[PDB]
Amino acid sequence: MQNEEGQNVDLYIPRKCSATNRVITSKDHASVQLNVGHLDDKGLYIPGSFTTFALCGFIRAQGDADSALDRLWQKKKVEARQQ
Amino acid sequence: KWVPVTKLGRLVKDNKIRSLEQIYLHSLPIKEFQIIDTLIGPSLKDEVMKIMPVQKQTRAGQRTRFKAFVVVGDGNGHVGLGVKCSKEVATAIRGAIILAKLSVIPVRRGYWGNKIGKPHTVPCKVTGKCGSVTVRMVPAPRGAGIVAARVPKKVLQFAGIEDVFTSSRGSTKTLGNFVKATFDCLMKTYGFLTPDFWKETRFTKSPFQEYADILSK
Amino acid sequence: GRTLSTKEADIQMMLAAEVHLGTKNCDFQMERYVFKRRNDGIYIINLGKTWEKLQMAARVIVAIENPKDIIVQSARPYGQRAVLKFAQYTGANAIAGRHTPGTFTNQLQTSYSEPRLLILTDPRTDHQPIKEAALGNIPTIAFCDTDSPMRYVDIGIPANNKGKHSIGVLFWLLARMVLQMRGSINQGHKWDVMVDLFFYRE
Amino acid sequence: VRVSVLNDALKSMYNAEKRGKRQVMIRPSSKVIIKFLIVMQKHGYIGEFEYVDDHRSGKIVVELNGRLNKCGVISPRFDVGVKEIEGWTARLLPSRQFGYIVLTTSAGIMDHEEARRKNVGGKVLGFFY
Amino acid sequence: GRVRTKTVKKSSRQVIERYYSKMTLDFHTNKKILEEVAIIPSKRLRNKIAGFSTHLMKRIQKGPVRGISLKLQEEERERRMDFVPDESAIQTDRIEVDKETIDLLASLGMSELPGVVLK
Ligand SMILES: [Mg+2]
């Protein structure tokens, strides 16, 4: 949200679930954030280089978080050449 | 003085975390009221809303305990609610203040029509429910004021909302449920997905990962 | 000759350890990792997906700057030694046996912990740790069988988490991958640590 | 019996979006449903939708972006003049900054802002946001 | 009845944990050791703690006792458990796998894995 002039007005921009797109609230303590590190040509982890995924409490309680994260990681690895 | 027992408390005492929005972004639990006191304590104001006695029947009479409801707020988008039952009214009030400080939440404020100046009302229609009490908040034009009963009006004033319309259904004479429904309605402000939030999220390191080396000791 | 690849040798060892033998029931959320059901009724797990999930879990683990923020625990007796050795070699913490309720929520408890990641041998027997972690924004990696519940499981590795040999092999495999990604040991299927060290023993 | 295929389709999409499904099935298909879906897609509340022919009413498979808070039908289709659009929007939409009311007018199926722009009235079909 | 209280039990456990080296199986020697290495307000309490400590020592001589952590017992257990056999108990030379596992490996492309044999 922005003013007519163009100034940011919101207190903060909440994160969104990487799978459901739901807004992650401040008291959604079931939500999680995961970093999947990247590997070089020799199968060595490169420090500071990872893909970040956020999962909401709704999906994690529903139990679809595992499959959703698997699909998202597969797509992101295909895009980023992580094999 | 204060000896933090959590990573978040340690970071707040070490000044690595300077704003409540950093915690709100990652939704980390807050288990020490000293964090809130250090971050937004100076601008916080507390108010006792009701002292409710409750009684438990026993073999040798009725055991009476008192319930204290406390509302804390900065009037600038931060509000919290606390309920504490205790034998003594003073102890109940102290516990309620601590709980409200711990339960402070961020409140999203938007515009009714033209977006000039600071926000004055709720971004969209919201509804909170506690027990049988349902409280609905509707955006209002500038100058409309806070159209609400005394309890929701106090909660909204502490939250910092300038003008809004409200409707209520159910046993609103149940003050605890009324205030809890108002708090839920205010909390639901940031959970609604609007077009301005359609932009893809750019994640940032959580505090525990950013200051992992500092917390490693 | 024809030296096997790392994945080939790894899947061979999984077959030797019987990691691909599931139970007679399959969870609807674990069905995607199951290959097919045999005439007897035991579901066969897909060792390729198991290896890929092991790789993913190792990738997630290696990204943790401080290994002491990772807690791995096993409720059942068989996996206690496996989790102990995994913690010893990867540098993480291990909790062997019963899990104290409130460990992740009671800030005043003496055993209070704030892990950045949780690792579990079986969700069914480690339900309480998973439920508690659901209250503290703690990511979860779990070794899930065909009938394991997937609730509050972030990364589920499809494997037989009931046999001592299977559990030991799985934890040895995860430790080897994490160490290789870190770069402290040589790449390939071989690792100086004896696999039997992770096996439950009378 | 089946009375409002548009209502059935919108309810199916709303339930699927709540459940978090990436794709939803609509059966039977209709040109009113297609126009409603096109209106939503124009503003970006849904992804691509594909029509499947079966020598019958047909079927539709719609991809869901995750941006749809709620889509619903208004029954009966009340007559809405150009001056009643403000009241209908106040009644149905969460806010004045976003949200759409779909109307069928003599100029075609369109959202309430386009109806206001063209100064055309009609009958309310539904809403989405 | 004669049931030792929490005070006696805790005192005996702590005394055994902290001074296992000098502990004996004789009640009089144990009570003398307790008098030397602890402050007990009551002689009756001292005798009760000494007797319970002797009983706990007798059990420990048999084997491990829950609630008591002995450095030597733990170190000996770790030393014994840390051993490994000459040959690992995982035979990759011969692996009997069912036709379903054969199909799984064929789908994976690992239809040539050495040692894999159908029943
Ligand atoms: Mg018709």
Side-chain angles (χ1 to χ4, degrees):
Chain A
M1 203 177 351
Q2 258 142 22
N3 203 38
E4 266 289 5
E5 296 300 320
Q7 324 178 358
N8 207 244
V9 167
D10 252 9
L11 275 161
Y12 73 122
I13 313 276
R15 288 132 66 238
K16 277 176 286 139
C17 189
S18 280
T20 48
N21 215 35
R22 295 181 159 226
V23 178
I24 303 166
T25 36
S26 63
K27 295 318 145 163
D28 181 27
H29 299 314
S31 50
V32 301
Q33 188 157 315
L34 292 108
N35 297 326
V36 195
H38 294 148
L39 267 53
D40 61 356
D41 292 332
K42 300 178 182 179
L44 273 169
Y45 162 65
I46 304 120
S49 87
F50 44 75
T51 303
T52 307
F53 294 111
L55 296 153
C56 65
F58 161 84
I59 199 155
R60 294 192 75 244
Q62 288 273 75
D64 305 290
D66 168 79
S67 60
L69 206 62
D70 191 31
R71 289 189 299 267
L72 299 154
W73 171 233
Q74 280 175 357
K75 295 231 280 313
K76 276 274 216 295
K77 131 175 101 158
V78 164
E79 282 150 302
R81 315 166 174 182
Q82 282 297 310
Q83 295 166 350
Chain B
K1 187 169 185 180
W2 172 38
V3 184
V5 305
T6 56
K7 288 180 195 169
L8 207 56
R10 281 165 243 166
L11 293 181
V12 171
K13 180 136 155 289
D14 290 340
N15 302 116
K16 306 324 327 190
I17 304 173
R18 296 189 207 63
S19 184
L20 219 53
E21 328 316 314
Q22 283 140 295
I23 300 159
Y24 290 154
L25 182 61
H26 301 92
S27 302
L28 308 174
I30 305 175
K31 296 186 157 287
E32 289 157 291
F33 75 98
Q34 288 105 345
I35 291 161
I36 307 299
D37 277 347
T38 305
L39 289 180
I40 76 141
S43 34
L44 269 177
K45 288 183 334 302
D46 56 28
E47 205 248 346
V48 172
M49 283 205 90
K50 168 98 160 180
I51 297 295
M52 194 187 120
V54 294
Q55 287 178 329
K56 200 196 104 152
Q57 186 76 273
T58 49
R59 172 153 109 261
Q62 285 119 68
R63 174 204 75 154
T64 303
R65 281 187 307 149
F66 298 95
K67 217 167 175 200
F69 304 81
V70 171
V71 167
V72 300
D74 73 349
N76 219 39
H78 297 98
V79 79
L81 179 58
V83 198
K84 180 76 182 171
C85 194
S86 268
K87 267 159 263 223
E88 320 304 319
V89 170
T91 307
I93 287 164
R94 270 183 259 119
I97 291 164
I98 298 300
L99 285 172
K101 280 177 179 175
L102 281 161
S103 84
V104 172
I105 58 169
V107 188
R108 198 187 184 205
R109 299 171 290 179
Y111 303 88
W112 180 81
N114 59 343
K115 329 217 201 84
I116 316 136
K118 323 310 289 153
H120 56 110
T121 184
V122 292
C124 93
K125 282 174 186 169
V126 275
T127 308
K129 186 177 158 75
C130 189
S132 98
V133 171
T134 291
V135 169
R136 187 202 200 197
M137 269 144 33
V138 175
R142 282 188 178 276
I146 296 168
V147 187
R150 162 194 100 90
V151 153
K153 179 153 187 185
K154 190 51 147 190
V155 175
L156 284 153
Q157 267 153 357
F158 270 49
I161 285 161
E162 271 95 308
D163 38 42
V164 57
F165 297 122
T166 58
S167 203
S168 98
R169 190 154 204 237
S171 185
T172 49
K173 54 188 189 170
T174 307
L175 169 138
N177 279 0
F178 204 179
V179 67
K180 282 172 84 176
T182 306
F183 195 59
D184 187 52
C185 200
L186 278 180
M187 166 175 354
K188 267 143 171 240
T189 42
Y190 255 117
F192 200 92
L193 183 78
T194 62
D196 46 23
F197 282 163
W198 285 3
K199 261 183 62 40
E200 176 107 329
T201 300
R202 297 281 119 61
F203 304 95
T204 54
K205 275 158 156 222
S206 172
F208 294 168
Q209 184 199 358
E210 206 177 344
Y211 312 94
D213 53 349
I214 290 166
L215 294 161
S216 301
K217 298 175 186 179
Chain C
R2 189 184 64 197
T3 59
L4 295 165
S5 71
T6 317
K7 184 160 164 133
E8 263 139 38
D10 276 322
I11 280 167
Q12 201 165 42
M13 173 156 90
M14 297 201 229
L15 293 166
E18 306 173 281
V19 174
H20 67 289
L21 273 38
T23 88
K24 331 221 78 189
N25 312 268
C26 194
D27 208 68
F28 79 113
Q29 274 158 345
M30 284 294 315
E31 184 218 332
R32 63 203 305 274
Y33 303 117
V34 161
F35 176 82
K36 99 167 298 273
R37 197 185 199 185
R38 83 178 168 203
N39 38 40
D40 156 17
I42 292 290
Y43 286 85
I44 300 287
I45 303 162
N46 191 347
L47 292 183
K49 308 172 156 342
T50 301
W51 195 87
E52 262 318 351
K53 285 311 212 86
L54 275 162
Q55 274 284 287
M56 190 172 157
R59 273 173 191 263
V60 164
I61 289 162
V62 84
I64 303 288
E65 287 124 44
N66 183 12
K68 274 302 127 173
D69 295 320
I70 302 162
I71 291 174
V72 57
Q73 50 189 267
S74 163
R76 73 161 38 70
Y78 284 153
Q80 273 147 216
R81 179 129 297 281
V83 297
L84 252 66
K85 305 274 51 187
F86 178 89
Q88 153 168 359
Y89 289 102
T90 44
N93 307 82
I95 279 143
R98 194 188 164 263
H99 162 88
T100 316
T103 296
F104 300 150
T105 64
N106 191 347
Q107 71 280 357
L108 296 190
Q109 222 161 298
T110 206
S111 66
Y112 182 62
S113 325
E114 302 200 49
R116 277 194 60 203
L117 182 59
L118 202 62
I119 302 171
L120 308 116
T121 302
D122 172 34
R124 195 167 292 277
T125 61
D126 288 275
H127 58 282
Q128 167 67 233
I130 280 158
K131 174 157 38 47
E132 243 199 285
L135 295 162
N137 305 89
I138 290 153
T140 282
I141 300 166
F143 290 102
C144 311
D145 213 344
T146 59
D147 63 15
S148 281
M150 290 324 279
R151 195 231 272 278
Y152 290 129
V153 180
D154 276 3
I155 290 166
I157 302 170
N160 168 23
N161 57 6
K162 330 230 181 283
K164 49 182 252 154
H165 279 28
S166 83
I167 298 159
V169 160
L170 291 156
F171 270 106
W172 187 91
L173 260 159
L174 196 62
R176 176 178 72 68
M177 262 154 244
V178 170
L179 290 181
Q180 274 165 354
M181 284 192 215
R182 283 192 201 166
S184 65
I185 62 173
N186 327 86
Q187 303 284 334
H189 164 253
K190 280 324 324 164
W191 183 24
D192 51 29
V193 180
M194 178 97 148
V195 70
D196 309 59
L197 274 184
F198 294 65
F199 289 36
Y200 179 82
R201 71 193 56 290
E202 301 170 352
Chain D
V1 292
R2 263 199 208 277
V3 170
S4 185
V5 301
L6 179 74
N7 166 73
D8 286 330
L10 290 200
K11 184 71 81 191
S12 288
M13 314 159 57
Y14 178 44
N15 285 349
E17 202 56 331
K18 281 198 271 183
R19 207 49 172 51
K21 302 158 100 283
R22 269 287 146 262
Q23 284 177 332
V24 69
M25 159 72 27
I26 293 162
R27 172 193 83 84
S29 187
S30 199
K31 63 173 97 105
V32 165
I33 290 163
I34 287 165
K35 307 247 155 53
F36 210 107
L37 292 186
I38 288 164
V39 168
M40 305 147 105
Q41 188 183 241
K42 169 198 190 123
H43 302 287
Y45 279 86
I46 56 156
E48 304 209 332
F49 66 96
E50 202 215 68
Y51 170 85
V52 183
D53 187 15
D54 54 12
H55 289 349
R56 294 166 182 81
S57 314
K59 285 175 200 77
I60 297 173
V61 183
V62 189
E63 331 266 5
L64 303 158
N65 284 347
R67 294 157 168 171
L68 190 62
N69 284 275
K70 177 168 198 175
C71 58
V73 152
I74 294 290
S75 187
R77 298 176 175 174
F78 291 103
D79 290 286
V80 185
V82 184
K83 274 167 208 312
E84 277 107 305
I85 295 169
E86 175 116 343
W88 271 102
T89 54
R91 276 160 63 174
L92 295 180
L93 305 183
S95 178
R96 304 168 56 89
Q97 327 294 24
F98 61 102
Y100 295 103
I101 281 164
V102 182
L103 314 172
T104 178
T105 71
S106 58
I109 286 168
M110 71 195 42
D111 51 281
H112 77 279
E113 295 140 73
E114 169 158 350
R116 178 171 298 121
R117 234 154 31 220
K118 287 200 206 323
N119 216 57
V120 294
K123 300 165 186 288
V124 64
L125 288 175
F127 56 90
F128 65 98
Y129 45 87
Chain E
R2 312 225 200 201
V3 180
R4 276 49 73 81
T5 36
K6 147 166 43 55
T7 88
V8 171
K9 298 230 169 68
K10 284 190 35 154
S11 266
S12 316
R13 289 200 264 272
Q14 298 167 12
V15 155
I16 277 167
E17 277 184 36
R18 285 145 157 291
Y19 299 103
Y20 182 48
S21 34
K22 293 188 308 314
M23 281 288 138
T24 89
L25 301 214
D26 173 54
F27 149 94
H28 313 277
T29 318
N30 308 356
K31 97 194 170 184
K32 295 264 147 298
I33 281 162
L34 257 78
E35 181 149 50
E36 271 313 323
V37 314
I39 302 161
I40 308 91
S42 34
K43 167 161 69 181
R44 192 152 146 252
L45 185 52
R46 179 263 280 151
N47 309 14
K48 281 181 201 251
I49 300 168
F52 197 62
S53 292
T54 306
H55 166 82
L56 270 191
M57 283 282 302
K58 257 165 87 144
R59 303 192 47 211
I60 282 169
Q61 292 334 72
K62 178 281 170 186
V65 170
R66 158 193 218 131
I68 319 174
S69 71
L70 271 53
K71 176 293 315 183
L72 81 152
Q73 188 65 62
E74 205 134 326
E75 285 325 89
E76 171 273 356
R77 276 145 52 213
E78 256 210 357
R79 288 178 186 179
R80 285 193 180 180
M81 293 330 78
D82 277 349
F83 91 127
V84 290
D86 311 337
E87 69 66 39
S88 173
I90 294 293
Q91 272 81 19
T92 188
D93 307 332
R94 254 208 152 194
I95 308 162
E96 286 77 7
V97 309
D98 305 346
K99 64 283 184 206
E100 277 93 359
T101 319
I102 312 275
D103 293 56
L104 156 52
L105 294 160
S107 302
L108 258 50
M110 267 150 232
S111 58
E112 73 95 341
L113 277 186
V116 175
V117 297
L118 215 163
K119 285 178 183 172

